[PDB]
Symmetry: D2
Subunit: 403 residues, 4 copies
């Protein structure tokens, strides 16, 4: 036997040669993208062999074999339907319905401190299967969607028990919404501004703020498989002009000796405003999400980006603390680690399956995207993705993991 | 072909006979117990044909075919290692090390506020495992009865959601943890108790089961309900604890009257009776083994693993596991949800009902409590368990560093 | 000279005899009432001498002299305009305007939660004054009995401190206002109720009076105590209010059970009994006149102004006036202390027991409550009173702008 | 007759002439000081005619007459024992033992969080009295300058209310104590600070004084005001403390930013500048003698007792006394209001601005603080003071048990 050859006969049909368009539509139908970085060597060798001629072009058994031999292990598993969602092409048609029925919820206010009709969802599974619907490629800032990401970096570089010398691990209480510190004089959790600010003070001490920002950008690039990550100076300067609450928080933390020694608080706050003005798209962000869904390995490159300890802690606190005052209601009904931001984003993680990012700017009165919240409810109302759904007895729900 | 076609010829060895002890030690090493109710028909025909014929006593394939034919589906996936934990004999050897490593934790105080919990020796300590396929294991003081106390709150919440639905129940009780000092308030800001796992919410949930009927039938209804969760293993009642809970309970009488004034019960409720039904549900008796099957029922989407019976709706089980995650270990719940990530529920007798979804249910029991109300040995065992297996709610099933995955063997 | 004789010459005009009607209207304009108890030796001797003959009936200087001689000390100060309010008849006419300007305040709802407080007309309204010298005045429905309800908490707290002292009593109850919503917590952080003016603290204070003795004698002792505080004017009891309060009081039962687990009572307490005693104490009946004398007793350092009897220790009167200042009007207590500055205590029947220390006691009553539980017309009257006289606790007695000062001439 | 002979009566003793020391010792024994500003015309003419005449030197009846003629009203009231405390020499001797008995109280920590406060020996301790008539007395370290710190909060609140009225000021600041674990919240539920005596509320009051003007005139305007409140005795400024407060004040910067975010200031407020104006007002310096005259102005309905000038409106003085009563001693306010019953305000330098309305103002000072921030010797002196005289806000002015009443003999 030869595993490059018998994949050739899976796609060949019995016909003696394989056209290359038939290979790319068979591939794009697994849900992989032909621009997948784990597919570079194979797609290099196929642009190479269509300069060779231009009369077709079908591939022999040795030509297909020498196009795919260095990527066949990932390609067989794709074609023997061994990915986390085997029937990926049906699943996106459900994503499309969930997207389109959430598209009809017009209500909400867009943050004013900017079209209210943008709405996009993007999926990245832990195997790299991708799909998008709507305005999936318009940049927007993470705002508070960065709080799990910089927390993950902090825990990765420093460990849990150092990070949680400075910030708690529990939800406030649905009217300790207003206190900055718990009773041990630590912020409640990394997902509120006070805790996020302290987490930002922990990343890359000893070096100046420009290199700190670069290190987080490098880190976010690995999480997104080197897809789109940018920076909006406009939101930066407007958050730097409007942040009297974050300035109040910084002065309270300084006096209560809540930062690591040698901290410049007023600078840390400017670093904090930079990190909330970082730009993503729904597609780039969904890869970040899928990195957390995949135990710390980026799904479209295979690179270990975050330690399992960071990814677990981050998923744990997005569960309890991730959707502002709606976190309890959200944890009960949806049961997924999620994190919302005031541009309208919701970074969503279905552990061991997929990462998601949906984005629509109109917010509900608790600060969460209306359409995003609607989509998340519908998704778990249709598939056994809820954290405490049973994988064997699940009533009317769908399990996209099965055939 | 068929399937006995090859289950017998699987372990037969090639030899045309299986001695019956070699079949039962092969069975008991899967971790099933020969008294498993789904093995009733098969074990009867082996007791019988060890009377029909007693000179062997080996089994032909045509004799083995009539012992296992009505239990064959469970016996092949039992023997083709398709149970959730395939190498069960290694797993229990880990359970044993974690049991013996928590056994050295001296600390804690036994609950004394009633004389009937101060009679349980502080040196008792038992853990029991019931996986979702019926595999069992026990170590320590595992057949000793003790009262559920607040381990019963998730069980009765699940009963209420099953019979009444999520939206009726939660007109009367919330779905979030207090806040680590709204732990003292009886009501959240919508004038509902915070969640079913605290005393005020448990009392209100008790108010919802089996309305219109008197307390004797209400209790019977919950007891048949708990009997099915436990696969008809031991469920009892300690009248000694009930009478002593009934007059040391001024806290719950304070709660009951506040809830009446704030009109938190359903119409037509006799609150002082509800308080007596509530004191009874907290005196229900289990052992670690019985309770571990109850837990495994929540681990199995609502089906009891040792009978195959549907006991709770998936919506009830999911709601109950959701609220045990956030609110199940008193003030320690946030830390527990972070570090352990398993749905668990603590009681003042020393129990910790533990559920690892899709894998197993557990009950650990040691009476000494830490200052927050949780069994010290349980808390340590739970911490040690998750530090050794990728059972945490947000461990990854593919990349888990040095941890073990007993759902795998390679 | 002589003290009975010069006064005859103050009242005589120069005339050789005094008609006895001219003497009693001269006396009633002092503001004293002819039924004043410190005045009965004198009013006995005038009923005696209008049997003599009924053909006159004027008094010589020796006939007037031994009618008034055993009450002469009180009548000279009365007629030498030495009472705390010398021009009492202008003051009542000001009190009359305050009564009539509050009569136009319609709002409020009458309590329903007992069919005994919802039977009361929404238009009854009375104010009564008893000064620390005994001068009396009333306007409106001042002789209609109604229940003290929570106006009794300062009274029983005073009894408690009188019998046991401040340091014993405040082992069980605090001395401060909670905070404008720690109003919903039962206990402060030392596991004592916040202060005797909230139900939790009132319940605990009820547990301190007359321990060891059964509830029937405990109730008798408090009634004797209230009898002295009111100069033996009207004190009654509504069993209708009692039984309806005792079947509707689920919050008060919640409170007692909570205080019991938290070991808040003195040892040997039967908690469920104490709640029944607490419900009895809130069904005690007064009128605006009877209650105003109780108030005037607190205004007068513990002496009842119409009998001269020491009723409460000065230590009890100060503590009770302090906590009525801080804690006496439910959620309005801060606003009330700021604007009115008078120790007051409101109850759900519509009463406001009000004290102007060193001057007068008052009780006003109108059943409609505002959204915080206080009588609308009572609250309005109290505001106007201090907006017109320098009675506010931190008004200056020398520089007070346009306010009136009824203690001066 | 007229007042100058009848003064010449009493002072003569029978002699036909008065030695001038004998008049001055009789004058100093009323407790007036010969430097009292209302007495300067009399004292100039006595210094003058002790140049004119070196002949004795006693004063004839016309020599006494034209020295006291322009101050004769204040000297007869002084010499007819008509001042609020007539036996001033017995009273100060009581003040002396109260001071000496608090001198034995070892405890407390000197505020050290700024080096300008560690430099104050923990053994300085002074109390000063200014009665509402100008009578003065001091014991201990009463001429040592120290900063008002938070004793300035009632003073600037009084300035704001005098210029702006109660209803404008309290659009931005409440009227109640927080609650004794709302020690940490900045705003009550209407998004106003709880009251002017906490840091957030004081900061907001600083927003209201002299808006539209820059900080230099704003400060000058407040300094005029304090000068007149102290009858032009010592009011200074510690620039050393100001720089250390603007350097350590992240909690006030935390507070300023929170108040900015919730629009608690008036439109057009520069908040970080208001924080600098607030740090200046806390470094204003007094001594115990200077400050005690400030206190007496609040004791006197807005008139400074040693100059006769109207400085604050009666409404300002009442509001400020009300809130010092409830909120002026940090977390100890409820205990203090209960046990002491006097308007007081403490500061972290160790001062306690104290007011006994209608009688006297005081400032006590010893730098060691107890764990709640109040001067240990001050709190003790206050307890002893009210445990000795019927000055408590709700003591009775007629029935006060064994306590002393310095307004009587
Ligand atoms: O603990 C201590 C001492 C302390 C003090 C300070 C800090 N630490 C400790 N004080 C206590 N006194 N009483 C207690 N038990 C009471 C049960 C009866 N009450 C309620 N229970 N639940 C209630 N719900 C609501 O208020 C609803 C609501 C409405 C609006 C907003 N939020 C919530 S009111 C009061 C609590 S605790
Ligand atoms: O909300 C409003 C208005 C309101 C009032 C009432 C009801 N609803 C709304 N008031 C507010 N005032 N200030 C606010 N902002 C922060 C809270 C005060 N500070 C703190 N931050 N964290 C803190 N915690 C600790 O004390 C730790 C601790 C110790 C003990 C117990 N528990 C906790 S204190 C900084 C400013 S909000």
């Amino acid at each position: 036997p030869s595993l490059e050859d018998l994949l050739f006969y899976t796609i060949a049909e019995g016909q003696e040669k394989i056209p290359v368009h038939k290979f790319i539509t068979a591939l794009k139908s697994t849900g992989l993208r032909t621009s997948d970085p784990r597919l570079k060597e194979c797609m290099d060798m196929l642009r190479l062999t269509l300069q060779t001629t231009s009369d077709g072009v079908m591939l022999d058994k040795d030509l297909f074999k020498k196009c795919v031999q260095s990527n066949i292990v990932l390609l067989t598993q794709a074609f023997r339907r061994k990915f986390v969602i085997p029937d990926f092409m049906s699943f996106t048609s459900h994503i499309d319905e969930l997207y389109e029925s959430a598209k009809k919820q017009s209500g909400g206010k867009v943050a004013d401190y900017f079209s209210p009709d943008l709405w996009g969802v993007s999926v990245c599974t832990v195997d790299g299967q991708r799909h998008s619907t709507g305005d999936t490629k318009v940049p927007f800032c993470l705002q508070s969607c960065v709080k799990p990401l910089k927390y993950a970096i902090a825990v990765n570089d420093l460990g849990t028990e150092y990070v949680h010398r400075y910030v708690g691990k529990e939800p406030s209480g649905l009217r300790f919404n207003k206190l900055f510190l718990n009773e041990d004089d630590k912020p409640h959790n990394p997902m509120v501004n006070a805790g996020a600010i302290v987490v930002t003070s922990l990343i890359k001490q000893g070096v100046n703020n420009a290199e700190k920002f670069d290190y987080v950008m490098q880190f976010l690039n690995k999480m997104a498989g080197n897809e789109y990550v940018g920076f909006s100076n406009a939101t930066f300067q407007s958050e730097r002009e409007s942040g009297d609450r974050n300035f109040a928080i910084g002065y309270y933390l300084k006096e209560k000796k809540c930062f690591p020694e040698g901290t410049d608080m007023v600078g840390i706050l400017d670093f904090y405003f930079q990190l909330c003005s970082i730009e993503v798209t729904c597609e780039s962000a969904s890869v970040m999400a899928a990195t957390l869904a995949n135990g710390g390995f980026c799904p479209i490159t295979g690179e270990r980006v975050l330690s399992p300890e960071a990814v677990r802690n981050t998923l744990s606190l997005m569960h309890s603390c991730g959707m502002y005052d709606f976190s309890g209601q959200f944890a009960f009904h949806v049961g997924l680690p999620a994190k919302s931001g005031v541009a309208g984003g919701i970074l969503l993680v279905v552990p061991n399956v997929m990462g998601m990012m949906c984005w629509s700017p109109p917010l509900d009165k608790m600060g969460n995207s209306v359409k995003g919240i609607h989509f998340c409810h519908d998704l778990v109302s249709l598939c056994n993705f809820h954290n405490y759904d049973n994988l064997r007895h699940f009533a009317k729900k769908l399990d996209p993991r099965r055939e």
